[PDB]
Design an enzyme around this catalytic site. Sequence first.
Site, PDB file in Angstrom:
ATOM      1  N   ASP A   1     -12.163  -2.837   3.866  1.00 34.13           N
ATOM      2  CA  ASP A   1     -11.074  -1.900   3.557  1.00 34.13           C
ATOM      3  C   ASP A   1      -9.757  -2.661   3.455  1.00 34.13           C
ATOM      4  OD1 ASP A   1      -9.411   0.137   3.221  1.00 34.13           O
ATOM      5  OD2 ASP A   1      -9.509   0.842   5.324  1.00 34.13           O
TER       6      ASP A   1
ATOM      7  N   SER B   1       2.392  -0.941 -10.749  1.00 33.11           N
ATOM      8  CA  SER B   1       1.812  -0.879 -12.090  1.00 33.11           C
ATOM      9  C   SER B   1       2.900  -0.606 -13.121  1.00 33.11           C
ATOM     10  CB  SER B   1       0.721   0.207 -12.118  1.00 33.11           C
ATOM     11  OG  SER B   1       0.229   0.423 -13.389  1.00 33.11           O
TER      12      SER B   1
END
Length: 330
Positions: free
Chosen positions: A35, A199
């Site tokens: 994770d 992004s």
Amino acid sequence: STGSATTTPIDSLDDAYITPVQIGTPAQTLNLDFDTGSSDLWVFSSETTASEVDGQTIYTPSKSTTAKLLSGATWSISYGDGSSSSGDVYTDTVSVGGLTVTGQAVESAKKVSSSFTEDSTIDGLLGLAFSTLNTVSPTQQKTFFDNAKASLDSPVFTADLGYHAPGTYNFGFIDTTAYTGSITYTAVSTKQGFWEWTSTGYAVGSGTFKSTSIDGIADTGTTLLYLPATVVSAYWAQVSGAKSSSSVGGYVFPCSATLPSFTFGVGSARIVIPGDYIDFGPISTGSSSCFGGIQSSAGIGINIFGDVALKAAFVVFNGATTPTLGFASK
Ligand SMILES: Cc1cc(CNCCS(C)(=O)=O)ccc1Br
């Protein structure tokens, strides 16, 4: 040094991925969920409340000649989905894919939430976010990656998750055979303890690319792609009959649909998520309503590039003094 381990979907939907990890001497192999959104290595154990164990393999520190109680240390974590676990701490030898760390903190669960007991396939988590998020008290502990870093050939690990197929986690090297084209690197903020990046925008299907900054985290331990409500509405508007259902808890779509792809930007580069990756199948067995793999982050406080996004790429987690993320197509 390096390590390389195969990671395998827990089910036909890719809800999560498990990677075998050797703990202790002689080795006890547990299948852990790697994770990148958390920083605790915790396991089902001989100490876990018996009613909360249902099929998981357990770590038994008393059977490990290298296990030491980390005296006085406790841990307690809560996850964004409501799930939790807590317990005490041992140090032991941990190996992943041939890479060994001695003195790793292994957080032994005394208690786990329903969501863990009911997943017999996941024997614990191995956190790969920054060690500043580790929950051990009173002495915070380092992740497996942070403990391995100095020994690695290069201070990196890579995630290469498969779509309905096994993939790979590598530590200490970048397998130049595992991706196509070039890797585009992008800046990381460690201010929240995550692999947080920005992004450069998105496209839906064959649509035009929208240049827009989307801060979010690269999180291998989250199934789906969680993005701002504007982006998510623009995606599902291209699927006849898709809607947000408050009863189900997100966007659903007719199982008869063909889903469009979703593109996200990494600097000037683009990663394309095929439409099939966004299908999470019937909401209940036999239903003709299907659950979407792109969901709103509105009720989270952060955008999450989870497995739906990451499995479309070869992802480099560069833990150099100035961390960065890299993405390549594959
Ligand atoms: C398997 C599993 C993993 C994790 C760790 N990631 C959680 C991500 S989120 C966005 O849901 O908070 C929690 C619970 C289970 Br159950």
